[PDB]
Design goal:
homodimer; 234 residues; alpha/beta; five-stranded parallel β-sheet; 9 helices; binds uridine-5'-diphosphate; binds L-deoxythymidine; EC 2.7.1.76 (chain B)
């Protein structure tokens, strides 16, 4: 595909959304697909939004009951939104790039996995979920396949302070220990590459790692210089 | 696709499995897609049989916990089996017909809808399922639109007797009233055609209704004859 798909990965509150919104305004050839759940949190009634708010809340409230339904619905929504941009926007750009906020791979290997490990999914649920993921991406994950990943690396402490700054009410109870786990998985996947997945191409996929421990809100030029560099090599 | 697609629909124990297996043998040009969920009940490997067998058994003990999960996997199981058969055979057939045991339509508008109406999925589970169902079918199931439907129509009382004939343990407690609901559901969809769906073409699909109250296992020729005539119109 002429559209380059680039995913932006990283822990809770690392600055993935902040970084994606930065990128979007820098190039007519650059488009972004935000992740689904972020929209689910705010208020100020589309169907995905009603479902999404409700299931978000049930998850927070009773994880061992709703993890499966939540993760399945998050992935559907993400896939449908990624496929929709990939089919709709960017059409007359000469070097078009679609940046995904997270990806189906991180959804399964970071989030869905920690849920199985947390006992929030039972064995049957985990394996139903992986099977669905498998079949459905081996139909669709192909036009979805990534040309590269960008890893936004912040420490848990950094990430915890940023949950605080964001101040989203239901998140203020997430403890350090939880982010240390998600941290470890990201490093396992994107740094040490010791993580094994079904998707064989992912082992060779180019990765750019950006340390984002320092606020980059009004000082992000150097990061972007790094991204443009990375993009010219795929 | 060059292959004609015909669903076999009917209340529980109306005889769909039975007929499908008769139809199988009749022509080299006729192939069948079995409905994933009976193989789940009986007592060797398969990850889907293992998953489905657990999910079905969990369904039986606590439907309000497991209905949404069961229905998702049942429906995934269906699309993949109907897509696999669509791809893998009747390539050398002069007059190819693939018979689907049940359909993604009955699974949703008959059975899932029943689970909701019985309070085994809440509104979000049901709204999520419907969203998921539309998309799983729109994006993946476009080659599975039906050319026809064959309705094996039997009285709630035929099916109760047939459930008693089949002697599946779990199923023996099934009441007539459950069957009547499901029967009226079938009647509205396929006879009256008052059941409105989210699938435009379906309102237009030709429907053959067959009386299967009289045993047909050793005496199926007039039934097959009506099938052969029906098919000729399409
Ligand atoms: O360099 C940064 C990165 C982000 N944030 C803040 O950290 C919070 C969470 O960031 P974001 O929503 O981007 O995190 P994500 O969950 O998308 O990774 C937000 O209030 C940001 O404004 C910040 O102040 N400086
Ligand atoms: O004409 C018939 C149809 C079937 N049955 C029996 O009735 C039960 C219900 O049949 P089937 O499994 O085909 O029903 P379905 O798949 O519709 O639930 C089974 O034990 C069949 O062997 C029968 O004795 N005569
Ligand atoms: C994005 C995502 C988040 N989570 C959890 C649930 C979310 O409330 C929180 C960050 O938004 O992390 C998952 O379990 N799976 C996911 O796919
Ligand atoms: C085939 C099927 C069966 N069922 C239920 C599940 C079982 O409790 C019973 C079969 O004996 O019917 C569904 O809810 N949906 C289905 O699609």
């Amino acid at each position: 595909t002429r559209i380059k798909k680039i995913s932006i990965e990283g822990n809770i509150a690392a600055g993935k959304s902040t970084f994606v919104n930065i990128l979007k305004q820098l190039s007519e050839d650059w488009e972004v697909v935000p992740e689904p759940v972020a929209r689910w949190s705010n208020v100020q009634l589309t169907m995905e939004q009603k479902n999404g708010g409700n299931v978000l809340q049930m998850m927070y409230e009773k994880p061992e009951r709703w993890s499966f339904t939540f993760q399945t619905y998050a992935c559907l929504s993400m896939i449908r939104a990624q496929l929709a941009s990939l089919n709709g926007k960017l059409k007359d750009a000469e070097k078009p790039v679609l940046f995904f906020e997270r990806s189906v791979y991180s959804a399964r290997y970071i989030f869905a996995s920690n849920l199985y490990e947390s006992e929030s999914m039972n064995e049957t649920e985990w394996t139903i979920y992986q099977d669905w993921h498998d079949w459905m991406n081996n139909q669709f994950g192909q036009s979805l396949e990534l040309d590269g990943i960008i890893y936004l690396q912040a420490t848990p402490e950094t990430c915890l302070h940023r949950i605080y700054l964001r101040g989203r009410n239901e998140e203020q109870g997430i403890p350090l220990e939880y982010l240390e786990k998600l941290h470890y998985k990201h490093e396992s996947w994107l740094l040490h590459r010791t993580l094994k997945t079904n998707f064989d191409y992912l082992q060779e996929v180019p990765i750019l790692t950006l340390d984002v421990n320092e606020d980059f809100k009004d000082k992000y030029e150097s990061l972007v210089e790094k991204v443009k560099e990375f993009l010219s090599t795929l």
